Scaffold this active site. Structure first.
Site, short mmCIF file in Angstrom:
data_model
loop_
_atom_site.label_atom_id
_atom_site.label_comp_id
_atom_site.label_asym_id
_atom_site.label_seq_id
_atom_site.Cartn_x
_atom_site.Cartn_y
_atom_site.Cartn_z
N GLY A 83 59.52 -37.21 18.50
CA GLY A 83 59.55 -37.50 17.08
C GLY A 83 58.91 -36.39 16.26
N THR A 84 57.73 -35.94 16.70
CA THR A 84 57.07 -34.82 16.03
C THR A 84 57.81 -33.51 16.28
OG1 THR A 84 54.93 -35.93 16.24
CG2 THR A 84 54.91 -33.56 15.80
N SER A 106 60.40 -29.73 21.22
CA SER A 106 61.33 -30.45 22.07
C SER A 106 62.30 -31.23 21.20
CB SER A 106 60.59 -31.41 23.02
OG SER A 106 60.05 -32.50 22.31
N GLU A 156 66.09 -7.73 18.02
CA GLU A 156 67.28 -7.36 18.78
C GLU A 156 67.96 -8.57 19.40
OE1 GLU A 156 66.27 -4.35 21.59
OE2 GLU A 156 65.25 -3.08 20.12
N1 LIG Z 1 58.59 -29.08 29.62
C1 LIG Z 1 57.83 -30.05 29.13
N2 LIG Z 1 58.39 -31.06 28.37
C2 LIG Z 1 57.62 -32.05 27.87
C3 LIG Z 1 56.26 -32.07 28.12
N3 LIG Z 1 55.73 -33.15 27.51
C4 LIG Z 1 56.72 -33.82 26.88
N4 LIG Z 1 57.90 -33.16 27.10
C5 LIG Z 1 59.21 -33.55 26.57
O1 LIG Z 1 59.01 -34.10 25.28
C6 LIG Z 1 59.85 -35.22 25.07
C7 LIG Z 1 59.16 -36.27 24.21
O2 LIG Z 1 58.39 -35.70 23.17
P1 LIG Z 1 56.81 -35.51 23.37
O3 LIG Z 1 56.47 -34.05 23.53
O4 LIG Z 1 56.36 -36.31 24.57
O5 LIG Z 1 56.11 -36.10 22.04
P2 LIG Z 1 56.45 -35.50 20.59
O6 LIG Z 1 57.42 -34.35 20.72
O7 LIG Z 1 55.17 -35.07 19.92
O8 LIG Z 1 57.10 -36.73 19.79
P3 LIG Z 1 56.20 -37.99 19.37
O9 LIG Z 1 55.46 -38.52 20.57
O10 LIG Z 1 57.08 -39.07 18.80
O11 LIG Z 1 55.20 -37.55 18.32
C8 LIG Z 1 60.19 -35.75 26.44
O12 LIG Z 1 61.56 -36.05 26.52
C9 LIG Z 1 59.85 -34.64 27.42
O13 LIG Z 1 61.03 -34.17 28.02
C10 LIG Z 1 55.68 -31.06 28.88
O14 LIG Z 1 54.47 -31.07 29.10
N5 LIG Z 1 56.47 -30.05 29.39
#
Ligand SMILES: Nc1nc2c(ncn2[C@@H]2O[C@H](COP(=O)(O)OP(=O)(O)OP(=O)(O)O)[C@@H](O)[C@H]2O)c(=O)[nH]1
Ligand SMILES: Nc1nc2c(ncn2[C@@H]2O[C@H](COP(=O)(O)OP(=O)(O)OP(=O)(O)O)[C@@H](O)[C@H]2O)c(=O)[nH]1
Ligand SMILES: Nc1nc2c(ncn2[C@@H]2O[C@H](COP(=O)(O)OP(=O)(O)O)[C@@H](O)[C@H]2O)c(=O)[nH]1
Ligand SMILES: Nc1nc2c(ncn2[C@@H]2O[C@H](COP(=O)(O)OP(=O)(O)O)[C@@H](O)[C@H]2O)c(=O)[nH]1
Ligand SMILES: [Mg+2]
Ligand SMILES: [Mg+2]
EC number: 3.6.5.-
Lengths: 54, 427, 31, 52, 430, 436, 440
Positions: free
Chosen positions: G144-145, G140, G254
């Protein structure tokens, strides 16, 4: 040596000293001391009663 | 096998020795009459380290009880464990030491030392291989501090390649009970710096501090202080009496302790000490033992280790434990604080691990710390000494026994250069 | 120092309060 | 008499960053160890008295 | 016909042998009492007498009694002849000088007599297996004198060293740099090949590969025993490619000063993790070159390989070995030196490794014990040298060593020799 | 795995901590003696965040109890959860601070703090990976304010990358307790600005108004306001201890709500509060929670947000709920009230959801609000301080303890610098470059 | 012989991969314990699991996946869940402290610790790959990660593997809703560092899937699992050619050739055509013409960008089920005549097609209806410049005052990287403009 790596070893483990007297409180364990005066308040009360009658 | 001849001189020495011998008899399963009634075969293995064997299956201690007046050894003879010593080894004088070092070192102890050397020779050559002797005394008295040093000297010119231990009790300025003890402590630490191989400095102030803040005892007597001393006295020689995954006898805690021959003043400490009401909140693990063991209040000497740099640290663990727990705790201690450990030695902690714990206990460990903070146990006593000596305070009781006034001067000079020895590694 | 009271129950919520969106909807398929 | 927007930006404009301490994760649980002290990176080969 | 005389020195040696001989007695049909409830594959380690007793070809040596007396009162007491287990009176107490000049002379004669009486029974004597530790007093001092004496009466006979290196971070002693510098200076001409293991590296391996958090020394001893059994497995079991004990020195030691290879046992996994993993030849030979599986805590990627002798067990097909090592030769992570275009020595055995009851490792069908001679060990010599130069600059602990008849120049001529050793390790990578 | 070492100083801190530990123990299933007695398995997985393992299934908390009067320790031991605390962690003084900041900061809290730091370093280095510390105290008190500021100052210099949250209690405009509250209040804010990461200001009159209006309590006691305080402490750290669709620990809230390092004074608020007579008149839905959460009559600091601008807003939700509804409710509350949110930050809402509600509760939410209406809380303290300090109202109880007259000047200088900084960020043009 | 390594990083990555791997197990015969229910053939059986699953010696199939997170509370649910026995224990990597919505934690300090462990696990998983095609990375843009450590993963993989294909499944920031404040900073930084280390980048929003679930599906108040199941259906329809028979097979290589015209525009949008509930499917015939027209509806798009605000550049269409290529030919011929759908002059072809006979699978508990036809359309359109401009403005408003930069400047990242990341995407803004003008 499963006992040294048992995750629930601390759950089944018993305290070093349970009550005022049981079996494994012996002088080489340094857990029971004679200077801890159990029956200290009673001695003071008895001596106060002796002083009262006198 | 590896025998230890135990000696004790003085009131304090004999009361510590009674506690120690009952503690060892507890560990090896010896009843108050002498025989064996334990439940494990491991307790008979190295039982001849401390005991001898008589006819009829009687185990007698390898003990020599020395005093200059008969009341104290009458008191230990009539105690709970006074029936186990052979009455030959009880040596007494008639006139007491008078809290005078010169009397015990020249006048009354020198005319008693021949029979005591006879007893020492008789008991110390029945053994096949003698590891070394052991003395318990205090530097604040007159017969333990005066004649005990004479005893160390005469068993040093006759047994040069053995082990000398002295569990000395140096005085404290805050808890002081004799007005002369700066003289005795100075004149005895003049001898202990070259006549002994290890020295364990124990303070009554530190023992009272332990009994007040750790054990929460309402009325600590002298018996509890002797119990706390005998805990570490039994803890330092537990690997040559019982098996272990990494054995370490008395000589191994000397080569790996003193970097130079003049620095062998240690401070003991016993790790699993708990109050009565704080017993159920305690987990008996290795990290809890090593964080309690290194604490400043848990030292049995009244010097704060945080004022100086540690030279070398021992830890003789007893019980059943894994090895990298200990090896990672002793690494964590050196890594967290790099300013309290000397920099010209890479590893400052020696690990010793036994197997058989103390009786009824899951796990235990002991502390032996060599530090540059021990100099403040000598600066205070030297300052009191030079406060008294500048006006010749009590010197007529000592010069009348036949010692010159040069002896005090050389004693304070060697105490001063011992302090300056411990100072050059502080920076 | 004795225990003063028996601490009224306040149990968990019956149906929710223990499922965390992975215990539910990620079980055995088993339709 | 200070504008707290100009100086809050100047404190990140006239600055340097904080350099992290090198740490490697060894296991899948997340145990972390120092990299320099453990014998993985070459440290003592570059000492001045090597081989002499 | 193919005998091997084991020698165990010190507490480390005796505790290692207590696992090695457990594995040997379980490998064949040998009970703890010495009987067998017939094939004659045990002559590499056992000699048969008239009473039907199989006596090990081992000499348990120590200067302290209470680590050998557990052999005398344990569960393997009937197996050992009384003159094999030899004890002194006083321990060296972490002192090289005490074990080399004062206390070692009283026991060296008796140990040599038992060695000679054990070597009369060997028609086809191959080599001596030595187990000791660098940090101890007996294992660093008396073992070096044992090499110095064994190299004269025998000479060209093979001698194999299984030494425990000082750990990188942890250290259970204080003067162990002194012991290490002296037993490394004096063993250099009296050791054909010095296999190196490290206690902390096996600590990490049982932490992260097996799931046993908090192992004791016993698990490390079992892993070392598995390595030793894989090393001499070709002398007792049928193999597609047999490896003799004199092939290791020829295929692992380029120069006489450089005889410190490393240890790596490949499929050391737990029974929980073996369910989700197939353990083919390519996978275990790729796990060998992962630095997380080395038994010495070092990174081989920061150096150059000198040679590689690598062994196999169980159902191993040679074309999988062929392609699996051909894969390793194409990885940019792994690098070799200029003057070694060949690189590898290959051995295949048929006997799968033996399991022990209550053990740590899982029952596998394939196994690899890789022996690597690498330039990456030069970070260990520099670090041990620095740890000495910290202490010898202020003459710390020297007085405990000059007392036992060793002059002050021995430390200096040790430091000269391992400065030269570091120079040799650098100058061959050019 | 992410532990929190708890601290509590003063009578207010200890009475808050007793209720907080009662609520945490009820959540995690710990009896008044210590042994775990839970029903499900999530209550034991992350127990080490606040608790320690002892023998026999007994759990000992991470708390350190600090005070100068043994009567407060006597009261905190006489509670329903007084046996669960380790007796060694009780650190007391002999003479009370006398409701003096200078005494508890310089004379009596100076020698006593060494044992407290000993307990803290003992109990923090036994952690797998420590996250940070918490502190509950009152700035109007004597030992609370002074010794808490000293503790924070000593802690930050030994662990300079952890999380230092303070659930401080600010003094009162309307009904106060002490006379000399402005001096301690203006001397404590100096240290909290430079030495804390997050600061939560809880005002007693706001809690009283909550208990009188929203809850209709006849006799609200200190054990009644401390329940609301304990709820907002427990709701913040709920992502560490229980799994969530969207997890946010203390550091995530640190990153999201603090745009500049000196602006970290927040405004708590607990969502599902409802009186006993109106309990059956509510349908528990997410719009109800977000409608009560953003209400001006629900904050725990006595400063309405209509008199300032919302710099950043958090909303940590607990319970099983839908993310679309939560996101659209935050959208609606941002777009309906346009002038109450700053325009140089496009999205002011940080959202977090944990699927485990509190014990007995079904859904819950916690409001953390960084607003520029917090400056008026400092304005009143500054006015009272200027009313007192102009004529040496009570200075002889401070200057005689060793404090300097110039030490009182830097206090309100830095406090009014903070006020002016909040004021400058309140009225800033979003479409503007600047001098740089 | 068609193996692809799925690398799920972040909470979004792990929660997406949960639904993805549930559907991967259900589509084949693999139980949640990693074993087949039986061995119906004497010695045969399909080897179609080799794209996703690696078979051990006896009977167990292990996924070719790495689950990376910096927080234990998301991986620990998989570790103690239903699919605990399915996953190899060392395939689930977990840090102790998380990145906490900061790109710098995931890129310089904390995420640079576990990068070696993930790289060695990736190498070990690629060792059993007989015919490896490329990596699939799920992350995403807002976390952060998922923003920092995924970028570091691309950083390392370009060094260690060269020109190997690596497709993205990103979660783009939404234009009006968000769950963070510092989301634009992470988006600009991790777009700037991976503008070139990604061959393709399929992005979907979260508000757009909310709108689709509200409108097309009958359900209200949805959760994240309903979005994750749809994303899993998308990624199954992308990789359906590797495991099932196809009239026209679509390799993973492709996509980059038929969807990325120029070396920086590699951000196509995904859409799934017949996403409808059961009772809406009861009244509707779902022929190829209807579901081909429904892909180009502005409301049916899974990213919140109006296609009428830009120009189509390339379209890749993947068909599933009872699909006649004649009807695909007719339906795509019909679309080119439309005026509301506008293309670019320099791409007269504009279409890549692929037909697979395998119908989509029905996961129990999902709200999707059993359909005989499905299209997963991946369209690269110039209309995304609205989204980049809005993200540009949102970064701009905060960077004018330098808000939140003390959290980034104090952790090894200098201030200048903001100034060049913003400058590079400001270049990309008119890079989109240069390809949207017609030559006359
Ligand atoms: N489609 C979808 N998006 C998600 C989900 N969980 C989190 N997100 C998205 O991820 C974004 C935030 O990052 P997270 O996945 O919650 O956490 P992270 O990517 O590990 O980042 P950190 O918490 O800082 O380590 C949010 O803006 C959400 O839109 C999910 O289960 N499904
Ligand atoms: N790896 C490993 N090392 C061991 C084991 N047992 C002992 N050691 C090592 O042995 C070294 C110290 O030597 P000792 O065990 O005392 O044996 P020693 O050579 O006889 O030394 P002394 O008893 O003093 O004469 C330490 O560095 C330990 O690491 C073991 O089981 N495994
Ligand atoms: N630890 C301990 N010290 C003692 C005891 N009795 C006396 N002392 C110390 O011994 C010193 C005086 O020595 P003393 O008892 O007269 O022994 P003596 O002079 O050798 O006979 C004093 O400073 C006391 O603190 C005891 O039972 N235990
Ligand atoms: N809201 C609230 N305020 C409290 C509580 N306990 C004490 N206080 C406040 O704290 C102030 C007294 O500070 P105190 O902690 O007793 O002084 P200290 O003991 O010297 O630190 C008074 O103004 C009280 O209103 C409580 O439980 N809740
Ligand atoms: Mg030895
Ligand atoms: Mg996360």
């Amino acid at each position: 040596e499963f006992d040294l790596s048992d995750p629930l070893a601390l759950k089944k483990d018993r305290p070093a000293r349970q009550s005022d007297y049981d079996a494994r409180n012996t002088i080489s364990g340094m857990q029971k001391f004679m200077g801890e005066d159990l029956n200290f308040h009673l001695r003071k009360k008895f001596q106060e009663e002796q002083n009262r009658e006198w | 096998m590896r025998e230890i001849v135990h000696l004790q001189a003085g009131q304090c020495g004999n009361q510590i020795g009674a506690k120690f011998w009952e503690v060892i008899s507890d560990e090896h399963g010896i009843d108050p009459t002498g025989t064996y009634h334990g439940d494990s075969d491991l307790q008979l293995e190295r039982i001849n380290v401390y005991y001898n064997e008589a006819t009829g299956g009687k185990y007698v201690p390898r003990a020599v009880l020395v005093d200059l007046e008969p009341g104290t050894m009458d008191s230990v003879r009539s105690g709970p464990f006074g029936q186990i010593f052979r009455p030959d080894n009880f040596v007494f004088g008639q006139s007491g030491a008078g809290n005078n070092w010169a009397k015990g070192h020249y006048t009354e102890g020198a005319e008693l030392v021949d029979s005591v050397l006879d007893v020492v020779r008789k008991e110390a050559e029945s053994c096949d291989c003698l590891q070394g002797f052991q003395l318990t005394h205090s530097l604040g008295g007159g017969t333990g501090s005066g004649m005990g040093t004479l005893l160390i000297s005469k068993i040093r010119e006759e047994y040069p390649d053995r082990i000398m231990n002295t569990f000395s009790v140096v005085p404290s300025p805050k808890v002081s009970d004799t007005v002369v003890e700066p003289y005795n402590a100075t004149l005895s630490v003049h001898q202990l710096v070259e006549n002994t191989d290890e020295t364990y400095c124990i303070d009554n102030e530190a023992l009272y501090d332990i009994c007040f803040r750790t054990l929460k005892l309402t009325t600590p007597t002298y018996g509890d202080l002797n119990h706390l001393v005998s805990a570490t006295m039994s803890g330092v020689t537990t690997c040559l009496r019982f098996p272990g995954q990494l054995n370490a006898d008395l000589r191994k805690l000397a080569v790996n302790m003193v970097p130079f021959p003049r620095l062998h003043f240690f401070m003991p400490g016993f790790a699993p000490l708990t109050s009565r009401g704080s017993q159920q909140y305690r987990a008996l693990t290795v990290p809890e033992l090593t964080q309690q063991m290194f604490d400043a209040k848990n030292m049995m000497a009244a010097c704060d280790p945080r004022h100086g740099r540690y030279l070398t640290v021992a830890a003789v663990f007893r019980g059943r434990m894994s090895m990298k727990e200990v090896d990672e705790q002793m690494l964590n201690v050196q890594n967290k604080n790099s300013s309290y450990f000397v920099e010209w030695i890479p590893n400052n902690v020696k690990t010793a691990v036994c197997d058989i714990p103390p009786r009824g206990l899951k796990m235990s460990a002991t502390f032996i710390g060599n530090s540059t903070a021990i100099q403040e146990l000598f600066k205070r006593i030297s300052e009191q000494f030079t406060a008294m000596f500048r006006r010749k305070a009590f010197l007529h009781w000592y010069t009348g026994e036949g010692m010159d006034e040069m002896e005090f001067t050389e004693a304070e000079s060697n105490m001063n250069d011992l302090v300056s020895e411990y100072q050059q590694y502080q920076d | 120092i004795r225990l003063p009271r028996g601490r009224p129950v306040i149990p968990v919520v019956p149906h929710r309060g223990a499922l965390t969106l992975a215990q539910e909807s990620y079980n055995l398929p088993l339709h | 008499e200070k504008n707290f927007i100009n100086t809050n930006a100047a404190d990140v404009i006239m600055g340097v960053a904080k350099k992290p301490k090198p740490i490697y994760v060894d296991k899948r649980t997340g145990d972390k160890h120092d990299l320099e002290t453990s014998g993985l990176v070459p440290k003592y080969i570059n000492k001045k008295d090597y081989g002499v | 016909m193919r005998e091997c005389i084991s020698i165990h020195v010190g507490q480390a040696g005796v505790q290692i042998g207590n696992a090695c001989w457990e594995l040997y007695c379980l490998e064949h049909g040998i009970q703890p009492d010495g009987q067998m409830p017939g094939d004659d594959s045990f002559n590499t380690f056992f000699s048969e007498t008239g009473a039907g007793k199989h006596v090990p070809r081992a000499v348990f040596v120590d200067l302290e009694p209470t680590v050998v007396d557990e052999v005398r009162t344990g569960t393997y007491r009937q197996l050992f002849h009384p003159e094999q287990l030899i004890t002194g009176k006083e321990d060296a107490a972490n002192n090289y000088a005490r074990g080399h000049y004062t206390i070692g002379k009283e026991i060296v004669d008796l140990v040599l007599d038992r060695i000679r009486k054990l070597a009369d029974l060997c028609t086809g004597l191959q080599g001596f297996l030595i187990f000791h530790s660098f940090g101890g007093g007996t294992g660093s001092g008396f073992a070096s004198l044992l090499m110095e004496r064994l190299s004269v009466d025998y000479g060209k006979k093979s001698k194999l060293e299984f030494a425990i290196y000082p750990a990188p971070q942890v250290s259970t002693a204080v003067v162990e740099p002194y012991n290490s510098i002296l037993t490394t200076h004096t063993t250099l001409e009296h050791s054909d090949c010095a296999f190196m293991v490290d206690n902390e590296a096996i600590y990490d391996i049982c932490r992260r590969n097996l799931d046993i958090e908090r192992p004791t020394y016993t698990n490390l001893n079992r892993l070392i025993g598995q390595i030793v059994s894989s090393i001499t497995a070709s002398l007792r079991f049928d193999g597609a490619l047999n490896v003799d004990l004199t092939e290791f020195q020829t295929n692992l030691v380029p120069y006489p000063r450089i005889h410190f290879p490393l240890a790596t046992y490949a499929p050391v996994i737990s029974a929980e993790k073996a369910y989700h993993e197939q353990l083919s030849v390519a996978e275990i030979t790729n796990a060998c070159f992962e630095p997380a599986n080395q038994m010495v805590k070092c990174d081989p990627r920061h150096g150059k390989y000198m040679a590689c002798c690598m062994l196999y067990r169980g159902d191993v097909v040679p074309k999988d070995v062929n392609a699996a090592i051909a894969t390793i030769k194409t990885k940019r992570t792994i690098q070799f030196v200029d003057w070694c275009p060949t690189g590898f020595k290959v051995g295949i055995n048929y006997q799968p490794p033996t399991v022990v009851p209550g053990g740590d490792l899982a029952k596998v069908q394939r196994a690899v014990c890789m022996l690597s001679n690498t330039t990456a060990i030069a970070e260990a010599w520099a670090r041990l040298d620095h740890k000495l130069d910290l202490m010898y600059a202020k003459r710390a602990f020297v007085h405990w060593y000059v007392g036992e008849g060793m002059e002050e120049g021995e430390f200096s001529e040790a430091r000269e020799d391992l400065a030269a050793l570091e120079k040799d390790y650098e100058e061959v990578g050019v």
